[PDB]
Structure 1
Amino acid sequence: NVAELKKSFNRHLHFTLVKDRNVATTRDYYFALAHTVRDHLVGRWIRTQQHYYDKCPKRVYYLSLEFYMGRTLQNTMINLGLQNACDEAIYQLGLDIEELEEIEEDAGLGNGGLGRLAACFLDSMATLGLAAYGYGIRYEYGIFNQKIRDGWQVEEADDWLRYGNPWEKSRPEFMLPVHFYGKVEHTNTGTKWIDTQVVLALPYDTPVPGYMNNTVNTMRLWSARAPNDFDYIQAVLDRNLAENISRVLYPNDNFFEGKELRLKQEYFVVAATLQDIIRRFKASKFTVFDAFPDQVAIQLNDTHPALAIPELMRIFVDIEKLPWSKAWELTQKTFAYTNHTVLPEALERWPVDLVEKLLPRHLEIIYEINQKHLDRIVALFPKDVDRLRRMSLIEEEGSKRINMAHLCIVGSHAVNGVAKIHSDIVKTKVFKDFSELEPDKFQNKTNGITPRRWLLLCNPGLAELIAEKIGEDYVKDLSQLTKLHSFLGDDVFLRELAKVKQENKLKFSQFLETEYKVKINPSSMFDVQVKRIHEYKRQLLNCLHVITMYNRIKKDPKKLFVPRTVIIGGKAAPGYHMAKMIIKLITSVADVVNNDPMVGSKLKVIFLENYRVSLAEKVIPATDLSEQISTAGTEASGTGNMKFMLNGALTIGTMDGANVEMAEEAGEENLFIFGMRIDDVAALDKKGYEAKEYYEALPELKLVIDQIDNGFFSPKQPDLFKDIINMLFYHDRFKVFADYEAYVKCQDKVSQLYMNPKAWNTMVLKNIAASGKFSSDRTIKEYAQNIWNVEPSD
C-alpha cells in the first residue's frame, strides 16, 4: 500500500531526521526512505532468526575478509517486492527516486571479484532459504575512491560511514574479546596463552533479504574497539592502535602484502567469528561438541581466514580440553576451503617470526598440525625425501614461512576452485601431491552472479523485455533463459533488444559527458574493459589495439571505420607501480586520440574513474563488447565476464577461467575466442619467451611500440613509458605481444559483425539465452548439496 509507505516516510522524516519539507536535504529524504524500507523487513528478519533457532537446520558460515556489497536501498526494495510501491510513494510526495538513490554510499568492503562473489553468495543463500551468515570486518574505510589527476591515479579515503549507515544494527550484547601477542606457558594443567593484549570485537548486523520469499539473513561484520581498561592523554589517544585493526581494507587484488596489521585483521575476524559460532552452537538445541560439524559448516573464502583452522583447535583443545585426535576430526569436518588465487605473488606465506610474535600459540598448533601430517606422509612413502618438503606447511629456504594454502588443505574436508579449468589446475598440478592422497577432496564450483543485482536492478529495460516474452520465472531459475531461443526468428524481438541496449547507452552517455569533456558518438560500439588493473588482465594489450586502431585511421583518413567508444576502467593497488603506469599510458593515449580532428567521431577513449559496484551497474548494461583478455591460465574464473553476457554484450576473450564455460554454453562460435590456449603458454614457456621477435615480425605492433618508447604519447616527457617497454620486452610473464596478432584479427571480425545489426543481435540473443548456468543460485545449490550438506527451503 502506497499510502502507508508515504505515511511511514513522513513519520521518519519528522521523528528520525527531525526535519520538515522546507529544510529537508536530499540526504534526509534518502535516510527517511531507507528507514522506511528497513522497517518492512524487520518482521521477516526476526522470524527468520526465530525459525533457525526453532528448527535447527545445519548453519552455513561464509568467512571472508571482503564483502563488496555496493548499495542496499534499491536491492532491498526489489527483493522485498516493494520497488513499484516505493517508487510510487516517492513520486506522489513530489520527489525524484533516482536522486534519493544516488545519495547512498557504496559499501565498498572488497577489492574486486573475490569480494563481489561473497556478496552474490549472500543474496543467493538468502533467496534459496539457507541458514547462512556472512562474517567479515566492518572496515571504517573500504576500497579507496580513485580520482585521475594529470592522467595519473590518485587515492582518496573512502569515508563511507561519515554520515551514518541506516542498514546496520550494532549488537552490543555479542561483543567478544580477542587476544594478541603474549607468550605460551606450558604447565601442569596444560598449555596456557598468557600476558596477551586484548581488543574488543563489536559486531554489526546488516539484513540480507531473499528474493520474494520470507527470508532475511544476516551479514555480521566486526568492529575493533579498545578494552575498557586500560601520560593520561597519550594513553587515551593510543586506544587508536586497537581500533586501527578494522580501520581500512587492504587494497591489493591478487597480491600478497605480508604486513602485521593485515595479519591482525585476519586473526581478529577469525577469533571473533569462531567464538560467536560456538556461542550460538551452545545456546542451541544441540563430546558436547560431537554434533558441531552437523550443525556448522564454515567456508574459508581463500586463505585469508586460514587461521580459523588453528583457532578452532585452540578452542577445542586449550579451552574445551578435548583430545587432539577428536578435535582434529571435528575441525576437518567443519571447514571447507575455496581456492581463488592461481598466481605466485598472490599466495599467502607468513613469516614464522611474525606469527610467533603475534600469535605464538597458533604457531605451536601449526607446527603440531604439520608434524602429524608429515608423520603420516613418511609412513606412506618411506623414502620419498622430497615429498616431505613439497607437502610441509612450513617453507624452509631462508626466511621460513607458513604456507597458508597447505594449512587450509589439511584442515578441510573439501577444497574447490572456481571454474572447470581452474579447479583442474589446482587439483592435478598445484596440489597434485595432495589430491593423489585423497582425490574425492578436490572439487569444482564454477562461479556465478546474482541475477537480482545484475539483471533486475541494473537493467530493468532488459529484465522486462524478457518478462514480456517468457514470464518472470527466470528470476528464481535462470536456466529458463533458454526459452528466448524461440525468438531466433523474430526480427521484431531483435529490434526490441537493440532498443533496450540503445537506451542504456543513451542513459550512460548522459552520465559520461557531464563528467568527461569528450563527445560520445551514440552510434559507436561501446567497447569495455572494467576490472582491477593488473598485468595478467592485460589492459595493456587492449591499449596496444587502441593505438593500432589510431594508427590505421591516420594513414587512411578516408577508409571505412566502424566507430568505437573504448572504455577502460579499474583501480590499481596503491603500491602497484606497473598498474599505475598502465593507467598513465591509457589516459595519455586517450588525450591524443580524443583531440585529433583527423579521427574525430570515429573513435573515443575514456578512462572510467572510480570503477566500483554501483558504477558497474551503470556501465555493464550499456556495453556492446566485453573485453576478457587475461592470459590463458591466469584468471581463475572471472565474474565480470558473466555480468556482460547476461546484459546483452558480446565477448572477446581467451580460453581462460569461466570464458571456457561460457563458450561451452553459448557455442564457441557465438563468442570471439582468440589467442594461446593454456598448452601454448606451456609450450612458449618451455621454449622461452622472446618478446623482441613479435616486434620485428609484425609491422603494426612495431609502430605502436615505437610511438610509446619515443614520446608520441608523452611529448613533454619522451622517456615516460620506459619501464613499460622495458617489461614488455624483457620481463612480461603475460606474453602480451604473443597474443597481439590473434587479438587484432579477432577485433576485425568483431568490427565487421557489428555493421550487421541482425547478425550481431542474433549472437547477443544466443549469449543471453545461454547465461542461465551463471546464476549464483546454481553455484550455491552445488555447494549446498556437495560441500555443506544443507538443503534449500522456504
Structure 2
Amino acid sequence: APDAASITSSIKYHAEFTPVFSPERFELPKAFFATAQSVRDSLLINWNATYDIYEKLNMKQAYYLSMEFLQGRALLNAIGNLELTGAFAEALKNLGHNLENVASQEPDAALGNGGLGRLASCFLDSLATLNYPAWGYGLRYKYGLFKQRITKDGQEEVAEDWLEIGSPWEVVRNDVSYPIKFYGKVSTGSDGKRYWIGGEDIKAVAYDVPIPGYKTRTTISLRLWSTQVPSADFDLSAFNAGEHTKACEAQANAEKICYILYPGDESEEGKILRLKQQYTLCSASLQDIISRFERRSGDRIKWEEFPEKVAVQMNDTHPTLCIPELMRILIDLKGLNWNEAWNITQRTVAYTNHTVLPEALEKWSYELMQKLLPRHVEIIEAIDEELVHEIVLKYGSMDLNKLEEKLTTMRILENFDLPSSVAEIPPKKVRMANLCVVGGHAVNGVAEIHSEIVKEEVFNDFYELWPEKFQNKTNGVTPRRWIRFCNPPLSAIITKWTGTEDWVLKTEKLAELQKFADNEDLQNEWREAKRSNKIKVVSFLKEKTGYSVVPDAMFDIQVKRIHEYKRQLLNIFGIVYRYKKMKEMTAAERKTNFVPRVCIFGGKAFATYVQAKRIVKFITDVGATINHDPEIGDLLKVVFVPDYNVSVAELLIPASDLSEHISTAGMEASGTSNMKFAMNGCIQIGTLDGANVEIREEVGEENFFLFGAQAHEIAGLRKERADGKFVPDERFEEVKEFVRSGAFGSYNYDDLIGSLEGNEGFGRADYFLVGKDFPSYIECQEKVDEAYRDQKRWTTMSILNTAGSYKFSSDRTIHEYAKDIWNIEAVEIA
C-alpha cells in the first residue's frame, strides 16, 4: 500500500535513473515523465497479476477491434482508479509541483479522432472496471490525424507531436512480432492446400497500453500495432551508390502504415494505404489472439473450442477483413475443412454498425483488393457463392423477379455474373458491410431507433433471412472519467447527497437526486460547483483563443466535427441574429432582452472541405467583430477553441450551461458528447435524432430544448425546396443580407451564402434545411433566454439532467455486449 512518501521516492528514482532529460533541476516536463513512470510501475504489477490469471484460467476473452481509440490523457484517471490521486498530489507538492500543472504537460495520446474512438476508449474503461477479460487492438498512429491551428485565415493543420519525446505509458514487446503480407500470388500445393507467397513482407510489433479499472486490480491492454521492416532491408549497395531515397523504400512503405489516421484516399495510393492499414490491424490482431489460444490450450488443442474461447468485435466496417483472414488461417495453415472453419468464424466475429445511410457503408475496388489481398478475394468469392446458393434454397425461383431483387441487395460481389442461373461497363466492387452481416453471428446498432433502421431499411432482406442476428446496444460514456475525474466539485455534491462514493460504480444512484432538485441548499452547491468549473475555463480561453470572458454568462457549447450537416452554420446564424437585434436597440433594452452569453465553438474541419473551413473562418470573423464591439461589452462573446479533443472536453463540459446537437434530424446515429454534457448537468438543445431522443426521454421533456423538423418530414421539405415551394423566413434574409453588407471583416462569404440558395445543384439549395429550421431554432433560443432568467427553474432543470443520465454509463452498454454478444463472465483478481 503506497504512501505519499513512497511515491515521492518513486518519482525521484525515475527522474534520475531512467531519464529523458539533463539532470539539472526538476522542471515540469521531467516532473511529468518521472511521475508517469512512477504510476506505470503500479500499472504493471496489476497488468501482470491480470495476465497470469487470464492465462491460467483459460476462460473466454473478448477482443475489441477499432481503427481508432481516443484515449486522451491517461494520468489523472490512472491515479484516480488506483485511488492514489491524493498520495500523488502530495508527493508532487514535496517535489515543488502541483498535480494539475503536472497533468498539464502530458499530450493527448492521438490514436483516434471521433466518437467511434471515444466509445471504444470508454468501453475499455468499463471492461476493466468490471473485471471482464477483453483487450483492445488498434494501430499506433505516429502523427494522429492532425492538430488544429486557429489563425487570421482560419483553420490550419499540423501533424501531432505526441510521440515527439515518446510516450511514458506504452510498454514495447519486442518478442511480439507478427509477419504481414501484401501483393504476391497464390498457388496450389501437391498436398491440396493453397499457398500465398511473394509480394511484400513486413512486421507488426506489439505495444501494450495498460488500462486499469476503477477500484479493481483488473488491468487489461490496448495493444497497438507498429509496422516496420527488419534492418537487413536497408539497401547498403544503393545508399552508398548515392540513391538515399531508393535505399529507404522498404522501411518507408512499411512505416507509413502507422503514420496518420484516415489518410487521404482520393488517389490510388491513398486507397492502397487505407486497405493496408485495415488488413494489418486484422491479421496482426488475429494472429496474436490465435497464438494466445494455442498457447493456453497445450496438448488438448481443440479447434472446435475456438469460438467458445474467443470473440472479435469489428467496430464498424473497418476490421471487416477479420473474416476472410480468420478463414484463410483456419484453412491454409490450421488446415481445417471449409465448413468447420466458417462455423468457427461466424461464432467468433460480430459486427457493430454505426451508419444510417446506405452509401456510408464501405465499398472497395475489386481489381484493387484483388491485387493486394488475392487470397482473401478468393475467400470472399466463396462466401458470396455460399450466400447465392442459400438465397436459392430459401425463397426459391418461382418468382425470379424477387430472387433477383434479393440477390442484388445481399450479394457481397457487386457487378458480377451469378454462378448457375436462370433468365430465359459498371465497375466491380466489394461491399464490406454486406460481408460483415454474412460472416458475423451478431449485428448491432447503437440506439433504439438506429437498431431498427438497420432491421427495416439498411439491411432488410438480410433481416428477414436471419432476424436472430440483429440487436441494439445503445451507447454509453464512462462516469469515472466524465464525472468523477473531470468534474470534482460536482463529484463531491454527488457523494454527499447520495451518502456514499459507490455511485462511481453503481451509477444508478444518480437518480436519488430527483427528490432534491427542488432543494435550495443543493441548488446553491450546484450553482457554486458550476461557476467554480467555469472560472477555470475563462483562463483557458484567454490563453488559447485570446479573449477574456465573464464567468457570469451562459456557456453555450457546440463541439463536434465541422460539417454542413452538423449545422454549426445554424448556431452562428442564431448568434448573428441575436447580435443584429442588439445593435438596433438601446443599452436599457439590450440587458432586458438578452442574457449574458459566451457561445463556444469547437472541432476540426476536413482539409479539402472548402466550406467546412469557410465556416470556422466565419465563426472567427463573427467573434472578432462582436467581442471587440464596445456596445456589446460582456453581454455576448463568441470564441473558437482550437484543437478540440478529450482534454478540451474534460474542461468545457463540467462548465457548460447549454450544449447544442442541432444536426439535420434523423441523420445522426447516436452521439456521445450529449451523454456527457447531460451527466454534468448541462442542458441540451437539439433536434429529435440519435441519442437526443433517449436523453430527452430519460431526463424529462421539460428538461431539454427541442426544435425543428423531424425525421419523417425531411423528404417532404426537400421536395418543397425541389419544386420551388419553399418560402424563407424574413429574419433569415435579414441575417443573409447583413453578412453581404460586410459587417464581419472584409472576408467575402458570398460562396458560403451561395450554398444556402437555389433549388438544385450538388452544393446549392440548403440541402440541410438551415433556412427551414432557422425560425423554430431562434424561437427556441428565446425560450432558453427565458429559462435562464428563472435561476431556480434552470438549476432544477440542470439537477435533473444529472439524475437522468445513469443509463448512459458505458458500464451498462458493456454488460449488454458482454452478456448478449460475447458471452464472457467476470474474472476476480485477488
TM-score by length of 1: 0.96
| CA distance 1:31–1:82, shift in 2 (3 Å) | same
Which of 650, 662, 665 aligns to 1:629? It is 662
Deviation at 1:156, TM superposition (A): 0.7
Which of 207, 210, 213 aligns to 2:210? It is 207
Tell me, yes or no, if structure 1 residue 237 matches structure 2 residue 243: no
Deviation at 1:721, TM superposition (A): 2.6
Instruction: Quote the Cα distance in structure 2 between the aligned partners of 1:258 and 1:313.
Output: 27
SS in 2 for 1:200: strand
SS in 1 for 2:320: coil
Tell me, yes or no, if structure 1 residue 735 matches structure 2 residue 766: no
Instruction: Give the 5 Å matches for 1:86-235.
Output: 86-188=88-190, 189-230=192-233, 231-233=237-239, 234=244, 235=246
Which of 808, 822, 825 aligns to 1:774? It is 808
Report what 1:676 is aligned to.
709
Report what 2:421 is aligned to.
none
SS in 1 for 2:750: coil
Q: Deviations over 1:164-217 (max 9, x none)?
A: 211011111110100000012244333221213101001100110011011110
| CA distance 1:90–1:205, shift in 2 (3 Å) | same
Quick check: 1:529–1:627 contact (8 Å CA) kept in 2?
yes
Tell me, yes or no, if structure 1 residue 421 matches structure 2 residue 454: no
Quick check: 2:818–2:825 contact (8 Å CA) kept in 1?
yes
Residue type matched to 1:733 in 2?
Answer: Y
SS in 2 for 1:297: strand
Instruction: Quote the Cα distance in structure 1 between the aligned partners of 2:758 and 2:121.
Output: 36
Instruction: Give the 5 Å matches for 1:272-283.
Output: 272-283=284-295
Deviation at 1:44, TM superposition (A): 1.2
Residue type matched to 2:413 in 1?
Answer: I
Instruction: Quote the Cα distance in structure 1 between the aligned partners of 2:740 and 2:449.
Output: 37
Deviation at 1:237, TM superposition (A): 1.7
Which of 497, 511, 520 aligns to 1:482? It is 511
Quick check: 1:316–1:322 contact (8 Å CA) kept in 2?
yes
Residue type matched to 1:566 in 2?
Answer: C
Residue type matched to 2:732 in 1?
Answer: L
Residue type matched to 2:615 in 1?
Answer: I
TM-score by length of 2: 0.92
SS in 1 for 2:712: helix
Deviation at 1:576, TM superposition (A): 2.1
Report what 1:85 is aligned to.
87
Instruction: Give the 5 Å matches for 1:705-724.
Output: 705-709=736-740, 711-717=742-748, 719=750, 721=752, 723-724=754-755
Instruction: Quote the Cα distance in structure 2 between the aligned partners of 1:18 and 1:714.
Output: 47
SS in 2 for 1:597: coil
Report what 1:545 is aligned to.
574
Residue type matched to 2:328 in 1?
Answer: R
| CA distance 1:691–1:121, shift in 2 (3 Å) | farther
Instruction: Give the 5 Å matches for 1:654-665.
Output: 654-665=687-698
Report what 2:420 is aligned to.
none
Deviation at 1:289, TM superposition (A): 1.0
Report what 1:267 is aligned to.
279
Instruction: Quote the Cα distance in structure 1 between the aligned partners of 2:138 and 2:318.
Output: 11
Deviation at 1:724, TM superposition (A): 3.5
Q: Deviations over 1:122-171 (max 9, x none)?
A: 00000010111100111111121100122411001102111021101111
Instruction: Quote the Cα distance in structure 1 between the aligned partners of 2:264 and 2:129.
Output: 31
Quick check: 1:416–1:423 contact (8 Å CA) kept in 2?
yes
Quick check: 2:545–2:641 contact (8 Å CA) kept in 1?
no
Q: Deviations over 1:11-44 (max 9, x none)?
A: 1112122879853321111111111111112221
Which of 332, 340, 351 aligns to 1:337? It is 351
SS in 1 for 2:634: helix
Report what 1:299 is aligned to.
313
Tell me, yes or no, if structure 1 residue 247 matches structure 2 residue 280: no
Which of 309, 328, 340 aligns to 2:342? It is 328
Which of 640, 643, 652 aligns to 2:676? It is 643
Instruction: Quote the Cα distance in structure 2 between the aligned partners of 1:616 and 1:321.
Output: 50
Unaligned runs of 5+ in 2: 416-424
Quick check: 1:64–1:305 contact (8 Å CA) kept in 2?
yes
Deviation at 1:710, TM superposition (A): 5.0
Instruction: Quote the Cα distance in structure 1 between the aligned partners of 2:645 and 2:426.
Output: 40
Deviation at 1:489, TM superposition (A): 3.2
Residue type matched to 1:739 in 2?
Answer: D
Report what 2:780 is aligned to.
746
Tell me, yes or no, if structure 1 residue 763 matches structure 2 residue 797: yes
Quick check: 1:144–1:156 contact (8 Å CA) kept in 2?
yes
Instruction: Quote the Cα distance in structure 2 between the aligned partners of 1:544 and 1:398.
Output: 43
SS in 2 for 1:222: strand
Runs of 4+ in 1 over 6 A off after TM superposition: 18-21
Quick check: 1:707–1:713 contact (8 Å CA) kept in 2?
no
Residue type matched to 1:205 in 2?
Answer: D
Tell me, yes or no, if structure 1 residue 564 matches structure 2 residue 567: no
Tell me, yes or no, if structure 1 residue 364 matches structure 2 residue 367: no
Residue type matched to 1:169 in 2?
Answer: V
Tell me, yes or no, if structure 1 residue 39 matches structure 2 residue 36: no
Quick check: 1:151–1:588 contact (8 Å CA) kept in 2?
no
Residue type matched to 2:649 in 1?
Answer: A
Deviation at 1:298, TM superposition (A): 0.4
The size of the alignment, in residue pairs, is 790
Deviation at 1:252, TM superposition (A): 8.2
Residue type matched to 2:628 in 1?
Answer: N
SS in 1 for 2:211: strand
Tell me, yes or no, if structure 1 residue 465 matches structure 2 residue 479: no
SS in 2 for 1:436: helix
